Amino acid sequence: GHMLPDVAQRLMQHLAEHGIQPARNMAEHIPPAPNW
Amino acid sequence: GHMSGFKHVSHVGWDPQNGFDVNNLDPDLRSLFSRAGISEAQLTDAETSKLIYDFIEDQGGLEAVRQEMRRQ
């Protein structure tokens, strides 16, 4: 929520105004996989 | 602008592609990002972190957004 008392609110707008991928999945970068 | 003497090192524990190195990632930044909603995954995403750095640079730099914490 943009109702933050610091610079953190300013960030929510700046990612949203472009198309940043939410903290969940379906992102570009992948988790490193351990090999045997 | 990056004419001479930029008060915001583009290194900033961040990698141009794979995002902020959350192991070498500044706790104050970590504070901000966690507030903003940006989690560890997002911080390590390309477009996300890239625009986060641009974000930080928009207000003048690292010290600048840190001041916003106590200022806004």
Side-chain angles (χ1 to χ4, degrees), chain A residues 11 15 20-25 29, chain B residues 18-20 22 25 29-45 48-49 52:
Chain A
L11 248 174
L15 288 343
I20 276 69
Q21 210 59 211
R24 175 62 197 194
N25 59 272
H29 76 290
Chain B
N18 290 331
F20 290 92
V22 295
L25 144 70
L29 297 176
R30 196 155 195 162
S31 195
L32 176 56
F33 303 151
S34 184
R35 294 173 186 181
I38 317 156
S39 187
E40 180 177 79
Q42 290 189 272
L43 286 179
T44 44
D45 204 61
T48 306
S49 64
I52 297 181

Side-chain angles (χ1 to χ4, degrees), chain A residues 4-12 14-15 18-23 27-29, chain B residues 32 35-36 38-39 41-42 44-48 51 54-55 59 65 68 71-72:
Chain A
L4 292 189
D6 72 313
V7 48
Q9 67 159 212
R10 191 107 73 202
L11 248 174
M12 299 188 185
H14 200 54
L15 288 343
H18 284 282
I20 276 69
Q21 210 59 211
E28 182 183 281
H29 76 290
Chain B
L32 176 56
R35 294 173 186 181
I38 317 156
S39 187
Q42 290 189 272
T44 44
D45 204 61
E47 84 204 288
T48 306
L51 286 163
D54 169 81
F55 165 87
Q59 286 86 213
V65 311
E68 315 221 299
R71 182 257 288 150
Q72 197 276 92

